[PDB]
Amino acid sequence: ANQFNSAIGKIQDSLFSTASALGKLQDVVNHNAQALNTLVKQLSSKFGAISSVLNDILSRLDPPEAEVQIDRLITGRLQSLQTYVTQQLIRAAEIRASANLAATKMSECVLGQSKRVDFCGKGYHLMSFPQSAPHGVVFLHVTYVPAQEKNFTTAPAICHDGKAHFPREGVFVSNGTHWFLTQRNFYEPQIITTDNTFVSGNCDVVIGIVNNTVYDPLQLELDSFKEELDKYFKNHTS
Amino acid sequence: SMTKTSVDCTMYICGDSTECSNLLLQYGSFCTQLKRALTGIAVEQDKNTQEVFAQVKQIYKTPPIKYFGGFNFSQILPDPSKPSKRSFIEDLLFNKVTLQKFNGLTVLPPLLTDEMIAQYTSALLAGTITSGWTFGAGAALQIPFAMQMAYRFNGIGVTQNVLYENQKLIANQFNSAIGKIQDSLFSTASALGKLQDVVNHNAQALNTLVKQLSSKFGAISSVLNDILSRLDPPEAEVQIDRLITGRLQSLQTYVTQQLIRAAEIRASANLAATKMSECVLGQSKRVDFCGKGYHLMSFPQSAPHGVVFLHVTYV
Amino acid sequence: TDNTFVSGNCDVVIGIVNNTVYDPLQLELDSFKEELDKYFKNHTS
Amino acid sequence: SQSIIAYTMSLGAENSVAYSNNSIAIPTNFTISVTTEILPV
Ligand SMILES: *[C@@H]1O[C@H](CO[C@@H]2O[C@@H](C)[C@@H](O)[C@@H](O)[C@@H]2O)[C@@H](O[C@@H]2O[C@H](CO)[C@@H](O)[C@H](O)[C@H]2NC(C)=O)[C@H](O)[C@H]1NC(C)=O
Ligand SMILES: *[C@@H]1O[C@H](CO)[C@@H](O[C@@H]2O[C@H](CO)[C@@H](O)[C@H](O)[C@H]2NC(C)=O)[C@H](O)[C@H]1NC(C)=O
Ligand SMILES: *[C@@H]1O[C@H](CO)[C@@H](O[C@@H]2O[C@H](CO)[C@@H](O)[C@H](O)[C@H]2NC(C)=O)[C@H](O)[C@H]1NC(C)=O
Ligand SMILES: *[C@@H]1O[C@H](CO)[C@@H](O[C@@H]2O[C@H](CO)[C@@H](O)[C@H](O)[C@H]2NC(C)=O)[C@H](O)[C@H]1NC(C)=O
Ligand SMILES: *[C@@H]1O[C@H](CO)[C@@H](O[C@@H]2O[C@H](CO)[C@@H](O)[C@H](O)[C@H]2NC(C)=O)[C@H](O)[C@H]1NC(C)=O
Numbered sequence: 001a002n003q004f005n006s007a008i009g010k011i012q013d014s015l016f017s018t019a020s021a022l023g024k025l026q027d028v029v030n031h032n033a034q035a036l037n038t039l040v041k042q043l044s045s046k047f048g049a050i051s052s053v054l055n056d057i058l059s060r061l062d063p064p065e066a067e068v069q070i071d072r073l074i075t076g077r078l079q080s081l082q083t084y085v086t087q088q089l090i091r092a093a094e095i096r097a098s099a100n101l102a103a104t105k106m107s108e109c110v111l112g113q114s115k116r117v118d119f120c121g122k123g124y125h126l127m128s129f130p131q132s133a134p135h136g137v138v139f140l141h142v143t144y145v146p147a148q149e150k151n152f153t154t155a156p157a158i159c160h161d162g163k164a165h166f167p168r169e170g171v172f173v174s175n176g177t178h179w180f181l182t183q184r185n186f187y188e189p190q191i192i193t194t195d196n197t198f199v200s201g202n203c204d205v206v207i208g209i210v211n212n213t214v215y216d217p218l219q220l221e222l223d224s225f226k227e228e229l230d231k232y233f234k235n236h237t238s
Numbered sequence: 239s240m241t242k243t244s245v246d247c248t249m250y251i252c253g254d255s256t257e258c259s260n261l262l263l264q265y266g267s268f269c270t271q272l273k274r275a276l277t278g279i280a281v282e283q284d285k286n287t288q289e290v291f292a293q294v295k296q297i298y299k300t301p302p303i304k305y306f307g308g309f310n311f312s313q314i315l316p317d318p319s320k321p322s323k324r325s326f327i328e329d330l331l332f333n334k335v336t337l338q339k340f341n342g343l344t345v346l347p348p349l350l351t352d353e354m355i356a357q358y359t360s361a362l363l364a365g366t367i368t369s370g371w372t373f374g375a376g377a378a379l380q381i382p383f384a385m386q387m388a389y390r391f392n393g394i395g396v397t398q399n400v401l402y403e404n405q406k407l408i409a410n411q412f413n414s415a416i417g418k419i420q421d422s423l424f425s426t427a428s429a430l431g432k433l434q435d436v437v438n439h440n441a442q443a444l445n446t447l448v449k450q451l452s453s454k455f456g457a458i459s460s461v462l463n464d465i466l467s468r469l470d471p472p473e474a475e476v477q478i479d480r481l482i483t484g485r486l487q488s489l490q491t492y493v494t495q496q497l498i499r500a501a502e503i504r505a506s507a508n509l510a511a512t513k514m515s516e517c518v519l520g521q522s523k524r525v526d527f528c529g530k531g532y533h534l535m536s537f538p539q540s541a542p543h544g545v546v547f548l549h550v551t552y553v
Numbered sequence: 554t555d556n557t558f559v560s561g562n563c564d565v566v567i568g569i570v571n572n573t574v575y576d577p578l579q580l581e582l583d584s585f586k587e588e589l590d591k592y593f594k595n596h597t598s
Numbered sequence: 599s600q601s602i603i604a605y606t607m608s609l610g611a612e613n614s615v616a617y618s619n620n621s622i623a624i625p626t627n628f629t630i631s632v633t634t635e636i637l638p639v
Contacts, residue, residue: 094504117371154382185625186625295611
């Protein structure tokens with residue numbers, strides 16, 4: 001909880017003071033504004049006509065002569081409009097791809113926990129929280145990152161009684177003298193028993209198998225009670 | 239990615255002609271838009287390559303001894319005996335995939351040279367064969383490749399004891415399958431046509447653009463000076479304007495086609511980046527995403543204007 | 554019984570078949586009980 | 599005396615994975631990392 005609180009506190013600094021991100025939405029706004037500005041400034045061009053104002057062409061020319069200049073302006077402005085619309089369609093397709101991706105991320109990162117790697121952040125996904133930005137969505141991806149790694153000596157299996165033992169879930173490790181069974185992503189040593197290991201064949205096929213004893217709790221309790229019963233029987237006999 | 243180009247409207251349309259450029263000025267900012275579009279395409283190509291290949295915090299290297307439980311990665315590991323430290327498969331791809339400047343058309347070089355792409359690919363491969371999926375989700379934690387492959391078998395629902403007892407057979411099967419990858423990449427045709435298609439499409443587009451300069455468009459000739467020294471200024475205005483309109487239409491067509499093709503290449507580059515994140519940096523449970531069969535692992539290899547994923551799966 | 558779990562009786566599942574699910578604990582306890590009974594019988598007579 | 603300098607791109611640190619023959623690195627702690635992902639909609 002403390003680590004998550006610290007990260008969410010640092011979020012407000014790693015968003016607006018470090019630049020980096022938040023430039024995609026600003027780029028979208030800038031591109032749209034630039035397209036509109038170029039379109040509106042294309043109205044001042046002449047495109048070969050005497051003047052860029054239709055009123056000025058009409059007030060100084062007879063109809064038959066003004067047809068040519070008005071037509072030059074019409075052709076130029078139609079070309080500019082067509083260019084604007086085509087660029088807008090291409091940009092709309094790009095933004096639709098981005099919006100489909102945002103919808104997928106909301107469905108899979110926020111509404112559930114995602115197993116897809118790097119889809120919802122760098123690390124193992126824990127969850128995600130949405131926020132709304134102008135013309136966009138901002139996901140805060142909470143992920144779990146392994147922190148302090150220690151290197152142990154590992155083995156693929158254990159041959160205790162001539163039968164190879166494989167881990168049920170986790171790996172065999174050794175710190176130098178003793179052998180434990182820990183989980184994959186967090187060092188939690190546990191004594192290798194018959195509960196967390198399964199037998200598969202003898203120990204003459206696996207490459208790298210090591211020698212260790214595997215504790216059997218059932219046999220331990222059975223031996224204890226058998227020893228007690230044998231002592232009682234010996235006392236009764238003599 | 240695809241070839242990043244650039245055009246000079248003045249050079250292309252009204253090359254070294256003063257009173258052709260003077261009339262071109264009357265068309266306004268019709269040619270700042272084309273310059274901005276081509277700049278956007280180039281920057282997007284660099285972004286595509288960076289997103290696909292730059293997925294590694296560090297540049298991982300394998301240990302000098304190249305024994306990984308019997309799996310033989312010699313054809314995909316880098317070759318130090320080359321100027322560009324590329325793998326055998328990468329060298330074959332770079333040699334196989336191989337195929338305007340006179341008039342205003344220039345070709346900009348990619349930000350990441352092929353050596354840097356090869357280094358990135360080697361980093362991803364070294365991480366994925368020396369640390370499994372742990373190098374993509376944090377710090378790189380080593381694990382013997384036999385144990386990592388047992389992990390991956392456990393991922394697809396087969397108990398790890400299957401791999402250990404058949405480790406030699408699995409290693410031989412993988413070696414045989416990786417040895418056939420050098421022949422099946424080119425002889426079978428099918429794939430590898432996409433990158434060559436991209437290069438050929440760029441060459442065709444540029445050639446058509448520069449060949450549009452030889453069309454009259456209804457003018458007396460397609461040469462500015464020929465119009466200049468044959469007609470008086472007021473009469474030559476119409477012919478020069480016809481040429482300007484034709485060449486502007488050619489340039490607009492080229493830029494629009496480039497924008498559409500760049501959209502398609504951006505979609506493909508996003509897919510390739512997703513495949514690198516999911517198939518290479520981890521193990522995928524998505525069906526048919528990382529090859530037919532139950533996905534075990536993947537290995538990237540750079541190719542001219544693209545990437546090649548070798549998908550190892552269990553059938 | 555180690556790799557199978559029990560849920561209800563056999564009158565609900567469609568296609569449930571007959572077989573003996575081996576129980577290692579029961580086998581070991583029965584063997585020990587037989588040995589103890591034989592020892593007690595020998596001690597008595 | 600600040601000035602504009604040109605260099606060759608550095609792709610990151612040069613870290614060689616200590617891939618041994620029977621050694622594995624297990625993490626012993628963790629971190630809860632909250633990253634950000636901005637998408638035009
Ligand atoms: C791993 O152990 C096996 C088995 O060791 C046997 O059981 C032990 C609990 C202990 O009592 C040992 O003395 C037993 O031998 C080893 O296999 C033995 O190898 C030696 C040397 O070649 C041979 O003389 C014995 O006959 C073998 N015993 C059996 C039961 O096969 C094996 O060598 C050990 N491996 C390693 C790497 O130490
Ligand atoms: C490897 O770990 C084991 C288990 O923690 C260590 O053995 C312990 O040693 C301490 C100190 O003498 C004893 O108090 C414990 O009872 C021991 N535990 C067991 C289960 O025997 C062992 O010392 C460690 N090895 C190294 C090299 O650090
Ligand atoms: C890792 O262990 C394996 C065996 O589990 C080694 O494989 C053989 O090791 C012997 C020496 O013990 C060498 O003479 C052989 O050449 C090795 N086989 C092969 C095919 O090379 C392996 O060498 C060990 N070490 C490393 C660094 O991988
Ligand atoms: C991995 O495969 C490569 C081939 O891709 C093997 O290299 C061959 O080795 C043999 C035996 O020395 C030579 O005759 C060939 O000329 C080599 N081929 C090439 C292309 O160099 C390599 O030996 C394999 N590794 C293992 C461990 O088997
Ligand atoms: C795991 O890492 C956390 C975070 O660094 C460690 O907690 C810190 O411990 C130090 C030393 O006692 C304190 O000064 C910090 O205030 C702690 N941070 C927090 C957020 O509580 C923790 O000790 C580490 N765990 C292990 C087992 O090493």
